[PDB]
Write a protein that binds this ligand. Structure first.
Ligand code: ANP
Ligand code: ANP
Ligand code: MG
Lengths: 367, 365
């Protein structure tokens, strides 16, 4: 393997009914590809640079970045690396009502990165479905809710108390994993769609002040893609095997407990989300400081999300993130925090390698 | 001058074991034989003077019935016609194939028929007006250190196990008093007598089988050569004799696992004792052949005492131990192997052959 950096992208969503009703001023502007922010105080205008910038604010202007465009700019390269045998990770970040549960999954009329990636992967595999390489796909779809793990592809029993919790455990080599996760086999995009629909029907959502359907649980969508390649060997064939993992992550939002006025369960889950995001920010800052040659420890273990995504934020995977921000003045502080974490995520690098899985058999040694 | 030829035969699976997928625990490496437990804890290694791996018909050196005969038994005929006494012992637990090797089927014969028919053939070839041959046979059994005959008709009684005695003729060595001896001219007669006797041989349905042998069977052929030589007159009476003995031993069997009370226990005890004395005599004979000064305890058991003149001296002894490769019979297998061994058992432990594919160490080198 060799060093590769985390691909950071940004997306400015358009005004919503709330920012229109309580009429607010546009503050986010794109200077070509830079993203600029003109504070109402007018002390200065901040300017942030990113590997990619997307302007889905307008629906007319040259620069309109639609869902297919976001796909063909971010997700297709990860599919290339997955076919190359690398693990890949993509995760969303942002505050409430920024469009993280839209960019990734999308609506029934404007699908997101998840359906586009799955369909494109299956189609490329069918195109390349020669007798040389036999392909296999497995999937899982789990969530995190008040620091508890839940399986989304497991239909709840005949009760309300059915969110049967699992637990995380560290395999000494493969790293963290979830015990009891119903991995399911994937033939094609239709079955993927059915499973995903069942999952999103099971996921924890709720209405609030700043969203009618907000996600109160982090979501991880994992694919395991196995290529068993045929080769002319003097003995038994089909030893060449490449196993690659794709991990797509829809996180929850910051949510100050004033705008999104809540009480009880809404508040409790709002607190847990906030703590998870704090730990994530600490991890990102620590990896950025690692990239500058200092000595730092990464608090992976302070939360289940970072624990189960340890090998992706750093570790061994081609990683990318999509920051989501609103263009209004009422969300200026959260926009700036998100943009700062995004830009200091760019300095992260991770050592991704091809997962040959032939250590101490013959082939990694022959290499 | 003598030497014990020790041979060990590993049978193949049967249809029942192949159906049940009974595992394999006996393996080969050329001459050596090994036992590797299913627990992967210990590896026992045995060496014998000859091995017969009848496990798979494809492997090179698959021991055919003809191979077994021509390797173990037939040189005994050479020594017999040379004028020297011979003994062939057969040992093996039930289910090992101790009969298939020795007596055999109607289609795949064994040591006994190949031996007898080759004997008849060589006799017919050597028969002239000057030299003649004469063959007598006897068939007795040993049960609780007592002798019985197998070639008489059971009289009209609840039991007619008439015992006999052993006596030491000062010249002819020991012998059995009152034993009937019959003349033979063909394998038809031999087969008829044997098929009569093996209905009288003591057998009972123990835990391990419906018919397990509880007596040591001795089948003796006395072959007399009458030749003539010039004595300045009528050439007459230059006489030689040779004794062939074929012994079928019974199985050991422990009585601590196989709970067994009464007559079964007495039988097993006597079997165990006779086999112990037999092993002592055999090892003493090996040391004598290797040149030490040794005392051979022929007299501590009836079988050894009766076969004294056919183990020691310028006589030729062979032993064939039959074993099964399955795992369920592993205690019997290890026991028979240890019994047949004459020099020493070798023991190691190894689980390092599985080198994760295609001998990984080669590319490491
Ligand atoms: N490019 C866009 N154009 C129009 N509407 C958009 C766009 N992006 C997001 N939205 C709107 O955003 C709303 C909520 O977005 P959503 O996907 O829930 O963001 P979110 O980050 O998932 N909120 P949360 O659940 O707290 O994480 C939807 O009702 C969409 O109509
Ligand atoms: N060398 C061999 N090759 C192939 N099959 C064999 C061989 N030896 C024995 N068998 C088979 O295994 C059977 C064992 O002999 P058989 O007399 O039927 O039972 P048994 O238990 O060996 N009798 P016994 O040994 O006196 O208790 C034979 O009948 C054959 O079917
Ligand atoms: Mg959401």
């Amino acid at each position: 393997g060799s060093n590769s950096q985390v691909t950071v992208a940004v997306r400015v969503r358009p005004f919503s009914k709330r920012e229109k009703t309580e009429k607010a001023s546009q503050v986010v502007f794109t200077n070509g590809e830079e993203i600029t922010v003109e504070h109402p105080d007018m002390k200065q205008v901040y300017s942030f640079i990113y590997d990619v910038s997307f302007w889905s604010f307008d629906e007319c202007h040259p620069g309109y970045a639609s869902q297919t465009t976001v796909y063909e700019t971010l997700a297709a390269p990860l599919l290339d690396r997955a076919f190359e045998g690398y693990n890949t990770c993509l995760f969303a970040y942002g505050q409430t009502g920024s469009g993280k549960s839209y960019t990734m999954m999308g609506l029934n009329e404007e699908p997101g990165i998840i359906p586009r990636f799955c369909e494109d992967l299956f189609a490329q595999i069918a195109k390349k479905q020669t007798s040389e390489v036999s392909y296999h796909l497995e999937m899982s779809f789990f969530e995190v809710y008040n620091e508890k793990i839940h399986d989304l592809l497991v239909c709840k029993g005949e009760n309300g108390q059915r969110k049967q919790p699992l637990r995380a455990r560290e395999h000494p080599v493969s790293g963290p994993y979830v015990e009891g996760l119903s991995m399911n086999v994937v033939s094609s995009y239709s079955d993927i769609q059915s499973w995903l629909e069942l999952g999103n029907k099971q996921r924890a959502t709720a209405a609030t002040g700043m969203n009618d359907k907000s996600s109160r649980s982090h979501s991880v969508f994992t694919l395991v893609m196995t290529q068993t390649k045929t080769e002319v060997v003097e003995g038994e064939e089909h030893d060449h095997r490449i196993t690659s993992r794709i991990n797509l992550v829809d996180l929850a939002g910051s949510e100050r407990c004033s705008t999104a006025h809540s009480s009880g369960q809404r508040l409790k889950e709002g607190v847990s989300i906030n703590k998870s995001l704090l730990t994530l920010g600490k991890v990102i800052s620590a990896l950025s400081e690692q990239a500058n040659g200092k000595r730092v420890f990464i608090p992976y273990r302070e939360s289940t999300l970072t624990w189960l995504l340890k090998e992706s934020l750093g570790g061994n995977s081609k990683t990318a993130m999509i920051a989501t921000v609103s263009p209004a003045a009422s969300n200026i502080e959260e926009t700036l925090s998100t943009l700062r974490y995004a830009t200091q995520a760019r300095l992260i690098v991770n050592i991704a390698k091809v997962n040959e899985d032939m250590n101490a058999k013959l082939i990694r040694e022959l290499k």
